[model samples]
Target: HSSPRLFMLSSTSSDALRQTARQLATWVEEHQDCVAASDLAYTLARGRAHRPVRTAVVAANLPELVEGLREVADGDALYDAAVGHGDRGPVWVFSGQGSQWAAMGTQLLASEPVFAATIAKLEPVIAAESGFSVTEAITAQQTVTGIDKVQPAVFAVQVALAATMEQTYGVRPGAVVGHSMGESAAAVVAGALSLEDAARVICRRSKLMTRIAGAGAMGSVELPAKQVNSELMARGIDDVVVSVVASPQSTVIGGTSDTVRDLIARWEQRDVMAREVAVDVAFHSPQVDPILDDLAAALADIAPMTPKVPYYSATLFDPREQPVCDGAYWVDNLRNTVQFAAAVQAAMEDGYRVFAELSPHPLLTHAVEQTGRSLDMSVAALAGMRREQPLPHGLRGLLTELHRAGAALDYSALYPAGRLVDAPLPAW
Candidate 1:
């Protein structure tokens, strides 16, 4: 509803005013309740950020005001996270392990009924599978940090968040994709696997991984996959393996502790950036070979089905072509390399411009954007939650992304049941 006139104000606008406005807009994003005249100016400036002002008017410490503006902006809010309004909506990308943290799902769990109920339904199942309740695990951030618990806990929260999107917001993904354990969550969202079946697969996979904790290591290097592999072979450091081709300049390697350390030392000497991933097991490499058959058997009864929407694969035979999620495929999901960059590139080529990471916070947002830029695609990467933001407000931020992209939404499910009021507008 914003016209070009309001958008540009006047061409003669002073540089002082413009700079101050940009400064204020950035500040308002963090403190939406500071009802100062500067705050209003900042909100006006935020039009360029594409995140529409939450409200035309508000008060001191107005937490819900920004969220309300999001409710009204339609497809003009959260500009930074909304790339285009094509027929395709968004591709949901779930994450695993290295990105998890304490209290990850607590805020959303308590704030969203659909999200909470979904988690509630899985609590006993998770408890039985891992001998710990999902609710309690999320509540005590410390308790869920264990590898065995964190994997399933993160999975449960992610899947529940997906369900909440559909059940509460009438949003269905155009495509579903994920990394590591997150692939299981995407499988469930894509309708190729049932929630219970996916959870069982996760339970078995995580339990088996628990047996190998700290036995291996993984690291990232500022080099392409081919170059990294070449360097490994050049040094007779064949023990270390490539886990993910994050980008042309960034790839993650995994293997035995000594071998990985040796590779990092080699990269460091050449002035290449290298760092170990926050993981106990060297996943996506030969170290995971032993558990393949066990994981296959664990998912033996999972019957594959044609995905209702496309399901991009991160660890499958051909990620470009959506594959059926069967027992054998689930096996490959654990034993194979994560082709995240390729998968993202394919999604973009297929015309999916919006990618929302379904984690406590966005773990792979940057990678998605990077991949998109490499392919010359206008991509918008959005996060489901902010690390320190309250759950409800964080969710509103995500919804703003979806809304701004012209995706289908169920506003009735979003805001509380009440009549709309014509609140007074702030003075200019």
Candidate 2:
């Protein structure tokens, strides 16, 4: 399955990482004591989206993603669904990659000890393992670009930010959902794995991306979201590709930069009605199918566990426990059409509201508004949580702002005692 190279990096898992996420999820369930039904999650970059639907596929490849999403949801949704006091889900949502850029946290990095000192410590640990600067790794590409260093750095940064948010503002999502690489962050928050394990995953995954092309030079489009894939098929441009996710009704195409430009040029003149996106690679399309087996070998052994919190996977497969999403699921995430429109509807039916889209882009807000308006669901991202907020230099500060801002506006009130600690404090 085609996934961010960070997902494939390690041949093993790390303990400190797993403890971090697990501890967080465990704490979330205890603090909230609530649950939700179904959570339809969308975690594509701003406008692009995908959701996996099969278990074998999810199991074989992107199992952690699938497991994490399910684990997060279980904390509140499934738990509540079973006990009848859950977070009231059927929630439709998305997340951002706060670690996506270097500037994002700079403000806080320069000002806050809670933030700066933390990253200062993390930087050396990451550098020691990956041999790449965290800031440079994150700044190298756009969200979901899948560059070797970028993917892991982005994941690590977001994880730190998420913890900081929990520390400063007491923000806690009942069911966490993330887009693209953000999915891994969400997984950690949900308790499916530890922070150290996540790190290992990120490092290994990055190496994996280097092995494959990792969609090195592709472009995407937002308008004409629905028909782009069909058009590709109609025109018989096999090299061209379209994402299967329809959550925001936007499409992300993948292929050679020149090939994508050619398609865009032709589409503009012939159709000219849609706005093409300026993206690095075409994701969630057939371009990465050839890498499935390579992914399986890397992903199979980790062994997924149930999520401590609620989560949703957007790569074309259902993130469930029994059937368990596996390698083929991830391969399909890289190849097949994602059926997220239905997943969104399913989450809505399950009862979720407000998806926090991360990274810095806002084009997706339109799609969520449109879908929510049409369905009468009312899903949206917090206005203050814009893309500019989560870069390397600015991330430390942005996280504080987002953490507090997010704290102030959540549909579900912030957990009161959550601020008593950050990563975890001694039991009272």
Candidate 3:
């Protein structure tokens, strides 16, 4: 045990001096192993750009001191991405495609007794409730998302699987988000609607997507939204077909195919590179307004439920965070572009230390990893791809032993106790 009464005094009272002399020793150590200046300059960012310090004393040619620190301090960056720390934030997961394989979550389903029992009971209720073959439907929707009826079928199934996981492992996320068609599922997990209500909404929403009226025009042009939009405008293109935006520097355009083709041709001729999407219809454009109306009507019938924890809607056209409402934002969502990066930034800015992505694939995971925060010690996922390895062996056990190793206190030397075991002049 440490001595109860212990005190020490420092002769000099200065924070700067406490950090001096030490700086020279540390700088000398770092000088031996700091990053190069040219590489740092090459990787300069619009945000905090970490550059190396150039000094003639350290080297004849290289700017080779603690320059990454200079860039960080100059940029006023609130977070740093190049370090690691103990696990603190909640786990954020971005699900992958085939996350719904035929046996999709067989282990999770069967292993989790709640879901296993749910499958036994709810599968029957689902068939009775929705009028479809439950087993066959689950099989079809897994690992595939392009079926006429299967779209609605699995949207609910995916949510059900997640709901069961909720029962299996309880977590109250501060902020929740989703991507592409994944938002519908993320909607309920964040508490905007009941699972049953969200299901009906999807049923109606997907049906309307298949039945959207008007030819307002839509296309997924590959040459980037700004470039394509400028070129398309030159050809007298109307509505500009929802300026293309996505995480990986691509645009999802919407309009009639002919107009999209014409826009593409004009773009190519005018030094604007463009390529068309394989999708048959333009989604999320003004053309989808009629569809949004139908879906909105369907949602209105369902009771409005407020979110318990915050959830963002994807409408910034590039995965940006937007506020949630019972129906207004969801309606606008169909009309706006998805801005995932902005949404992720919003979540982070709003004191969200961790994010859980319910995407069908790791599309959002890569985005999350790409976004660097200077303040955070590190960003980690409890369950994710790109795992840390060197696969555990006896070496870890050795490290654990080292971690627990300690030296016993020698207070006799430090404190020189004068008393014996004296309770009443007691002897040792």
Query: Which candidate number maximizes lDDT?
Result: 1
lDDT of 2 by residue, 233-314 (tens): 7878777666545555555566666667777677677765344454454555555555557766765654445677656566
Please, what are the lDDT tens digits per residue for candidate 3 over residues 1-428? Answer: 21122111111112322232134324434543453333222222111111111111112222223333233223432221212111222323333122344533344343445545544544544454455654555544344344234444445444654544445333334456655455666666667766566556555555566665345444444454566567657767775575335433455567777777777676678776466654554666677776676667766766656666556556644333334445556676566776554565555555444444432223455455444343341333222111121212211221111111111112232223332211111011
What C-alpha lDDT do the candidate models reach, one value each?
0.70, 0.45, 0.44
Better of 1 and 3 by lDDT: 1
* TM values, all candidates: 0.78, 0.59, 0.55
All-Cα superposition RMSD per candidate: 7.9, 17.6, 16.2
Which stretches of model 1 miss by more than 4 angstroms? 1-82, 141-143, 405-428
Predicted structure 3, TM vs. truth: 0.55
Q: Which stretches of candidate 3 lie over 4 Å from their true place?
A: 1-107, 114-130, 140-148, 169-171, 213-228, 248-250, 258-278, 316-325, 351-356, 370-428
Per-candidate clashes come to 7, 103, 37
Tell me which residue pairs clash in candidate 1.
Answer: 25-42, 33-61, 33-62, 50-79, 51-78, 51-79, 54-69
